[PDB]
Ligand binder design. Structure first.
Ligand SMILES: *[C@@H]1O[C@H](CO[C@@H]2O[C@H](CO)[C@@H](O)[C@H](O)[C@@H]2O)[C@@H](O[C@@H]2O[C@H](CO)[C@@H](O)[C@H](O)[C@H]2NC(C)=O)[C@H](O)[C@H]1NC(C)=O
Length: 195
């Protein structure tokens, strides 16, 4: 609903949990709509408190949307490698995590149906789901500990997002809506504006 345009030079929307409600979770739900033409960008990153490795990162690499996270132990990647999503068009991404398991869903509305065939078409929903499962007898770690910041825009990774982000949802937090409503725990910097 609340859409922010990240213009030339990039920008950043930061949400800081009250230093005293910093959550630790077994499961996560993230949703965001986006449009971009970028080959590479970081869209959203949830980092833990200083001194901890835990993080969750939504990014685009080689035109493809994916999420990388760490919850103690190994870095875990889930990527949707069939859709090229950097076409300046709208897409919705949905990510869930349960311990080391993870699901990623990417919806798109292509207007083309393919010796491929350039057939202009009525746009239709094309959904892709990827599930990643780990099979140890509950052996690796499962908790994203002490979540401190949700940073939207990718500047801190040296990979700024340019284009449109909307409708961010994270564990009950409608972060871009809270930004729009001038939430005390949100800071906006750079070339970012509310549509
Ligand atoms: C992460 O996932 C494992 C495995 O999940 C199960 O295995 C298949 C993998 O494709 C999946 O399709 C099924 O939905 C199924 O849930 C979970 O561990 C398994 O589930 C139960 C406990 O709910 C155990 O009794 C099983 O023995 C165990 N299977 C194996 C092979 O280890 C695990 O709980 C889950 N992690 C979290 C935190 O949700």
């Amino acid at each position: 609903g609340s859409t922010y345009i990240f213009s030339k030079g990039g920008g950043q929307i930061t949400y800081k949990w009250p230093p005293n409600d910093r959550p630790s979770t077994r499961a996560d739900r993230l949703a965001i709509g986006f449009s971009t033409v970028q080959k590479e960008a970081v869209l959203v990153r949830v980092d833990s408190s200083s001194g901890l490795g835990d993080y969750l990162e939504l990014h685009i690499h080689q035109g493809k949307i994916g999420v990388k996270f760490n919850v103690g132990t190994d870095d875990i990647a889930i990527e949707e490698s069939n859709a090229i999503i950097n076409d300046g068009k709208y897409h919705v991404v949905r990510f869930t995590r349960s311990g080391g398991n993870a699901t990623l869903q990417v919806d798109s509305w292509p207007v083309i149906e393919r010796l491929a065939i350039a057939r202009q078409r009525i746009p239709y929903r094309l959904g892709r789901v990827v599930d990643e499962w780990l099979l140890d007898k509950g052996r690796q770690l499962t908790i994203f500990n002490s979540q401190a910041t949700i940073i939207i825009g990718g500047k801190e990774q040296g990979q700024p997002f340019q284009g449109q982000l909307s409708g961010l949802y994270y564990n009950g937090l409608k972060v871009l809506n809270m930004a729009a409503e001038n939430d005390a725990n949100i800071a906006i910097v750079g070339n970012v504006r509310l549509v």
